[PDB]
Amino acid sequence: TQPALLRLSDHLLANYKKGVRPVRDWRKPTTVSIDVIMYAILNVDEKNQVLTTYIWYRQYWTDEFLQWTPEDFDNVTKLSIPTDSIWVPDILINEFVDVGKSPNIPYVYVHHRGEVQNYKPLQLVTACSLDIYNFPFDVQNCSLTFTSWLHTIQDINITLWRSPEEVRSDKSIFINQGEWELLEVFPQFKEFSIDISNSYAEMKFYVIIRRRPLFYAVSLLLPSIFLMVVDIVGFCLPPDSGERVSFKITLLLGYSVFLIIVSDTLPATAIGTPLIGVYFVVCMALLVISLAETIFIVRLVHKQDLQRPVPDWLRHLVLDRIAWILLAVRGLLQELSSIRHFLEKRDEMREVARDWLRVGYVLDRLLFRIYLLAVLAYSITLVTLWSIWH
Amino acid sequence: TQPALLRLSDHLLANYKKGVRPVRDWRKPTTVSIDVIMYAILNVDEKNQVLTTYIWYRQYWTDEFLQWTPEDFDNVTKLSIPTDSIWVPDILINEFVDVGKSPNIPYVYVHHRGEVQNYKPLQLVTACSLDIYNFPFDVQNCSLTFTSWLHTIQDINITLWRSPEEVRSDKSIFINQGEWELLEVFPQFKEFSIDISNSYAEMKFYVIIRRRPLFYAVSLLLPSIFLMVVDIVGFCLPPDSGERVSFKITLLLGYSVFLIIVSDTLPATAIGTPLIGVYFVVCMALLVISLAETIFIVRLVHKQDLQRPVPDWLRHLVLDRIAWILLAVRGLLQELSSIRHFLEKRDEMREVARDWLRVGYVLDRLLFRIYLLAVLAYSITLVTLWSIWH
Amino acid sequence: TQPALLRLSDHLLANYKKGVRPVRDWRKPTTVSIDVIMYAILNVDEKNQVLTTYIWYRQYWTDEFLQWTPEDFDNVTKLSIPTDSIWVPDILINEFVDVGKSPNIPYVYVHHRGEVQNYKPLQLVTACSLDIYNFPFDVQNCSLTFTSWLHTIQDINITLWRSPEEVRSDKSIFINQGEWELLEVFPQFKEFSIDISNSYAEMKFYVIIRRRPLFYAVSLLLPSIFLMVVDIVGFCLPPDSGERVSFKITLLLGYSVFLIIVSDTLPATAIGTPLIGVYFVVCMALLVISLAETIFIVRLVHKQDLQRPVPDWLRHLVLDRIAWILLAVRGLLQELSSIRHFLEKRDEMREVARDWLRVGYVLDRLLFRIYLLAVLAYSITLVTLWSIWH
Amino acid sequence: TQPALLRLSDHLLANYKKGVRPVRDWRKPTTVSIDVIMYAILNVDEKNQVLTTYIWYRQYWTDEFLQWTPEDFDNVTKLSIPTDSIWVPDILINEFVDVGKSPNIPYVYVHHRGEVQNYKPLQLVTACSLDIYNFPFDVQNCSLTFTSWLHTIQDINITLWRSPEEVRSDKSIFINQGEWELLEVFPQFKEFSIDISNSYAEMKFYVIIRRRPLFYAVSLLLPSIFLMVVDIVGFCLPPDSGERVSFKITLLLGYSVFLIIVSDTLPATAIGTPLIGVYFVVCMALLVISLAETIFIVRLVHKQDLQRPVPDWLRHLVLDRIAWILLAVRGLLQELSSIRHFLEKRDEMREVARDWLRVGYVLDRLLFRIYLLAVLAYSITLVTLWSIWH
Amino acid sequence: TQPALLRLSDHLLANYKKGVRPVRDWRKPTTVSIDVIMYAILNVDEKNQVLTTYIWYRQYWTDEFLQWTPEDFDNVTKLSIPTDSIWVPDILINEFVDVGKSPNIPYVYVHHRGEVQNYKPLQLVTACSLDIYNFPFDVQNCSLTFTSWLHTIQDINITLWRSPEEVRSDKSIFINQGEWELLEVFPQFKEFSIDISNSYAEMKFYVIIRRRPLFYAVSLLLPSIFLMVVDIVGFCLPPDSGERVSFKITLLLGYSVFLIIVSDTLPATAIGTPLIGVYFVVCMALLVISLAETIFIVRLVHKQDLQRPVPDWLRHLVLDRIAWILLAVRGLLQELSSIRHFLEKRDEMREVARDWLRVGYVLDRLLFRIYLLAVLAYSITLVTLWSIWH
Ligand SMILES: Clc1cccc(Cn2ccc3c(N4CCNCC4)nc4ccccc4c32)c1
Ligand SMILES: Clc1cccc(Cn2ccc3c(N4CCNCC4)nc4ccccc4c32)c1
Ligand SMILES: Clc1cccc(Cn2ccc3c(N4CCNCC4)nc4ccccc4c32)c1
Ligand SMILES: *[C@@H]1O[C@H](CO)[C@@H](O)[C@H](O)[C@H]1NC(C)=O
């Protein structure tokens, strides 16, 4: 007479108590078989160390009160029942630090043997230990522990819907265009107990994710390489030009502002600075060494009245070794003698300055070649370090 | 006696089960016809790759229990019934990453043959693949897949209220003053199944949106063009003025700070930098080439005591080819001879410096003209690339 | 016996159906009279083009089921009834893009003839077309369309509680200390229909708001005027000082950083830059013209060994028209003659440089006067454009 | 037999209507006595002009239906009753612009004579007029108007739980470590009516809060004082050194970037800039005056070939008043005469330059002393303005 | 016949009033035993002075109505009962300033003797007094006061589930990779009463947390040390080079921008600046002292025409003590005499300038050594202050 679904719902949900764990014998637990597949990784925030993810979640447990024989209800084998009308286990995540905003699924599937199937999408904001030591290339290992918050293992136990290898091999629906690439989701069963009897079942889903370094190549290497190139370009200025020191200090100011700006994107954790901070401070040290060498050569070549003739040891060393590696008439006479003496003093000062300038030029050329070799060695070291990672 | 609407509501909603799928025969699914119209695009966030939109959404399905004959109820053909009092399908979007804040519509229309019509606005925060390769002029292709989360295709199926061409041609209520211009909404039906029997109906609305580049013309082209113009202006400074290198390095510092500031607005995805990053680094390379040319010409013209006379080959080459392309009396004699020799040495140094300065000036003019031609060629290349897009 | 209010509530809310539109005859619509007064304008966001406002909103409709005679209930003419216990129309706003957070008013007034009065505060986040073409002085025109989302005009119709002139003249409770000044709220009734029969009642409240420009005078005009003043101040440096070009380029760098910082506060829409962007680029062009003049005068006055005597045409033109507008003894002779020739060459070079320096000084004074006149003309043009707006 | 509390709850809440105002005679209003004490001031946001506060709030009203005699119920005089089970007045705040997130208190106390006591914490986001004219030392006067949103004064009236002096003297639980110091909370009863009969009771709690200026001393005065100090330090550079104008312009650029950075923390309202903006622009004026006077002295002392001897009036004025305030032999003769004439011209130019340099040095010393006195006067004026405030 | 759990739930929750405090004798209070473990410290915000934490919270109280004998219900000793079906105490925290978003646990355990056990996670946003006086090394002392909001001590009283030493020793589940390290959680019972009879039970959990300074070593010491190092590097430039003052002022500008950028990360409270602000301003003062020394030496060594010979006292003092610490023929004669006099004047000026330059060089070396010693003393003082903390 009446529709089969209406009769079945009247048979099931009438005189049914949704606050009772659905077991005829209270000594057996309800085994909630859960399953998790990752849809997207919305945000990994290394400052507060929380991971935002969206997962598709499904679980099923045996409801010993929602059972019927199909033959009495027009051969119906399954029907959808509202989630509010039946008992639902309190499975949530330990690592929660903020309840997510996820849609509510109002219906669940019930089979004729009691297997209630619940599908639900979840937005998860969970705490995790984010090790940024290898920041551009770091691989993170975040856990998602599903468990019953109140019920012990004697009341609610948790298993897997699918074999752990199948869970590990899932990368199907994952949104992959973002910064973070999902490697694997590894499930593992554990019992959490700090008491002899109070044992709580758990299911740890180790979400392992890898950052894509292509986001940061242009943002990190390009400015540093650009400034190191313009350092070599500015090296060509003659030391006595009077513009070299200004050029170098302006370049150092530019590098300083670049560093203090890019530090906003560079994360910081209990480890401190990441590994690439060492490379950044090495580049800054190279620039400082360039500035110091420029100042030294400026000190050498600067013409000033206290300059004494170049010492014999320095003259020999630089200009050979480093070069190889690379009566009224009597009154008239007195006036001319005095004028000649003045001009001779001026010329002697000029020649001493010229000798010092030559020594400074040779040393500047040698130190420029040494600095260029050091920069090339640093660049090839970085290239080989990147190559063995690729 | 009683009002027609009260009697009709008593007839319908009494002994009516809202947890039962409204089919007299459980073998036929409820076909939920779906219609979606985009009202606005609130935010396209390429960093986290989520799309925020507001859509007007309506659906209708046949409720076989909410049926009556009009003649018994004062010829009423339709009435408004609360949403909470009837069965409502769980149609929601797969691409959800955050449940939106949308008003709740409490009433739905029910016709005398069971057609229940539901109208509701929806704020959607959905994941999408945002390709910013053509960032100023990129056109995005975001999908909105409506499906029943729990029910399979044997329970709930999805069709279109209107023909797909009519859905595609809809641009009526779209808020259009914003940054993003809606091109079309293209619906197309898929079955999603990773099981032999568990098939889920789906309806993908491909929301295709195009960015308006007028937001970024002033923010991008204007600073680069302005700095290129001032570079050409500063080219006019004489190479021996002692201010040209400072001008060039200050301009390079200004361009560096401009780049590191504008990089906050430039998005970054798994692709890396957008295509216009190539143009930006080409402009920076042109500035660096200008700086290198300035430093080289300064090296040539800088007067210093180690300068030797201009070599014959360079003198000929530059100053012809490039120019075409463009007794106490004896004691008195000795002192005068010495003074003349000092002045002769000074004059010879001055004349050698003058010859080198002439060579440097000619080369500076030639290289300035070459750089101007290169800048003009780059500008017209950019203009002709923009023209074929417009 | 019993209290009058208890008996009245028992008479009304018993056997009362809150899901039924309250009309004894279903052919007549329920006319919901709408009134809106604005409390404050919380935020106008020209980037996403959404308007956040707080309004005091009230409506009243005739409830044909909540009617009684006062004489039976101790002469009670009105009572407060919970909003959840009676039918409430679904009046909301089309322009919604985000449901606001507003307090829920649990009670409504019911009169003895069925007039149900509903008072409720509303926080509205609505989309609007924000034209920033006159950004400092722009007047915005944002609509608020109240309508029944589901019900057609045959079911729910909308009127005004007060005449449109009274609504237009309301500026009483409006919080006025903020950036935005409310001019008027203009109501207008319209029918929205894209079908022959499905006509929906609407009531558009055109909220017209005006920005207060005093927020931006100090933030916008003051830096530009200050940098223009220091430009004229630094213009006085002698062209041959060797510091004028550095001063000018430092000033241009300061203006560039000021522009790229203030661009964060300057909004951008589909129009592009606002009108004051033209004024800003004009000021930047004036600074660039000053820099170019400085470079030209430096080119003229710069002392270098390739300088030739000032041509007759330029000498006449500038220095008249522009100024008006503003034997061993024979061996002794040879050495003296050679020394005199050296000194004569040096003096000739010095005098040619002096003549060029004089020409450059006169041209610098003339161009300074021209530039000062141009700056004054620009300032008075801006002042007279502001005056006609005031 | 049964527990006293169970019997009392059965006696009270059975056949009790929570939608009815608890009065046996509908002509008497329910007097809701309000009491408010402030716990903390979470955020004062002068941009959007909203005040965020957390208050402890309690109210009590006479419920004429929740009355019993203690002797019948084991001498119980009060019991806790759920909030949802009884009538609760709709007391909320007019100044609301955003409903706060506050915990829900489920229970209220009911006395044997009907006095129902409701305790609840409230987070309040309310609009206020924030006058920032004295930004570092401003005192704010924000109101909190508690009133019934729907009920008129004939239905719900509002009084004070405690005397207004006791409310004014409350500073007990206030969290005081923050930026804002609470002075007093002043209650005042008003009637709000824009109709002859529709009068609404109100209770205005004038929350008066004072900002602690110690937050801003280091952030505001210290950079300005430091830049003034380095201005005086760099003043000592000789005017002809060639570095003074570069120093001054670099300092002005530093002050400009400091101003445009600190403007992010300086608020802006309809008043415009605060009062300390005048002091900041005075500091900018002093720096610009220093720069202009430096340029003037550079103009005086700059050695150039067009210099004429110092005029008698300027020489006398400065260097007295301001200083007090502070045959082949004939052919031989011709060559010697020509050489002497060249050297004499050079010496005359050198001496004229020396005289101009002396005049410039004396004027520079005088203007340095004048500028130092002006800076000291400004500093003591600021100190004496701060002292009368302290 | 029926399942034991169903019969037990029917026995318990039938005719059970969830709004009644569960005591057969109303004179006894319900002692709620509270236990708390900190899971993580999500955010410590010293600006608004709120502490965001996630805690695991459990409580148990005696329910005198949910009591049964196990032998009547198949030896069941405990069962899970929904939280909504039973009376739950209103325990919340005084220090709340924003209700947290925490998951809702629907079930609680009930034992056969009435012990109802409630487990729940809690996100807490609580006010606290954050003293930043020792900012990089500060240890905070935040309190969490759990109490019943409405109920007095005669109705609800609070104890500890575990002994206070056990609570103090808990650091098990705490997420420890973040910036803040948890030291201890110290519980302490207090009574809060501002009335003779209205005493409220309270329980304060003093959460003591310590910041990890390793976050800020690279962000604070590294830039300051780098700029101090480049200050010493630029100290080597000769004072008469003409680049030393530009170098020093550029370095000071770099330090100024570094300070005004790092001030965004440095917090500010009612105390004002933290203690390390003194160290920062001391470093800036050292830089200013270096700049003043450079300017003084530039004043000494600057060659200008008004230089008089070095005074005897200064010559002796510096160059000894500080060095130790570290007829037509008659017409021919007249012209020669005049030329010799000109050259003699020039040479005398040159020699006076040389003497002043020597004095300036010696003083520059002495002051460089003094400044280096001062910098070393400051560095070792900072190191020895850090060592006694470590
Ligand atoms: Cl990608 C994949 C890989 C293996 C197995 C499955 C099975 N499956 C089918 C559908 C479906 C699922 N739905 C969400 C979207 N609407 C239909 C139901 N949520 C799920 C949540 C967790 C685990 C599996 C599933 C799932 C899928
Ligand atoms: Cl723009 C357009 C173009 C063609 C057809 C229609 C039909 N239509 C009429 C009204 C209406 C609609 N409402 C929202 C505003 N209050 C009245 C009901 N929501 C809708 C949501 C999705 C699809 C269609 C509609 C719709 C519209
Ligand atoms: Cl300013 C003004 C101007 C004209 C008419 C009125 C009448 N009026 C009186 C009170 C009141 C009103 N309430 C909110 C505050 N608690 C009492 C009720 N909300 C309203 C919402 C919309 C329109 C009118 C009103 C209104 C006022
Ligand atoms: C209903 O409509 C029919 C026509 O279909 C008409 O004959 C009949 O009179 C109508 N009844 C009422 C009550 O309007």
Author numbering:
A (entry chain B), B (entry chain C), C (entry chain D), D (entry chain E), E (entry chain A): 8 to 333, 397 to 460
In the authors' words:
We report a first-in-class triple acting compound that targets serotonin type 6 and 3 receptors (5-HT-Rs) and monoamine oxidase type B (MAO-B) as an approach for treating AD. The structure possesses the typical receptor features: a pentamer is organized around a central pseudosymmetrical axis that coincides with the ion pathway. The binding sites were located in the extracellular domain, specifically in the clefts between subunits. The transmembrane domain contained the ion pore, which featured a closed hydrophobic gate (data not shown).
